[PDB]
Amino acid sequence: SIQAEEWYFGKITRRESERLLLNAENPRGTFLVRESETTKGAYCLSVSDFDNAKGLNVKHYKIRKLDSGGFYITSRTQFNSLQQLVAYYSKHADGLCHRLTTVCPT
Numbered sequence: 001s002i003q004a005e006e007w008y009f010g011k012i013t014r015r016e017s018e019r020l021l022l023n024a025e026n027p028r029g030t031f032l033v034r035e036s037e038t039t040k041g042a043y044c045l046s047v048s049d050f051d052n053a054k055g056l057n058v059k060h061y062k063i064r065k066l067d068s069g070g071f072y073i074t075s076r077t078q079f080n081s082l083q084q085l086v087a088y089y090s091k092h093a094d095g096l097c098h099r100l101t102t103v104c105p106t
């Protein structure tokens, strides 16, 4: 159950996710998963990043959920659960701004 996950923030807005992630104390890869503001049944993986060009900034990746069961950011790489997706992207940056590291503080 995703509701049970500490990185699942459920129904918060994109702006709020940004407010929480743009904390100077957050290293690259700080993240949270939330409901998409405008797509029923899809989620957003909000991730903090940092470089000298943009400083501290946030990237939002849409996570798709198949009726056929799979979770994915890119259809080429699917998972049986949102937990497995989160675990995979904590080890591989692949197309993300940074691999997932720590859950975002409130």
Ligand SMILES: CC(=O)N[C@@H](Cc1ccc(OCC(=O)O)c(P(=O)(O)O)c1)C(=O)N[C@H]1CCCCN(Cc2ccc(-c3ccccc3)cc2)C1=O
Pocket (backbone or CB within 6 Å): 013, 014, 035, 036, 037, 038, 039, 044, 059, 060, 061, 062, 073, 074, 093, 094, 095, 096
């Ligand atoms: C409005 C905005 O910010 N758009 C996001 C997509 C997006 C994300 C969340 C979202 O939330 C709803 C909300 O704000 O509530 C909505 P909305 O519902 O607002 O329309 C739209 C975006 O464009 N992010 C970028 C992220 C950085 C990379 C470039 N890109 C394309 C891409 C390329 C490669 C990969 C990839 C990832 C991992 C491995 C392999 C490939 C992923 C994305 C994005 O999507």
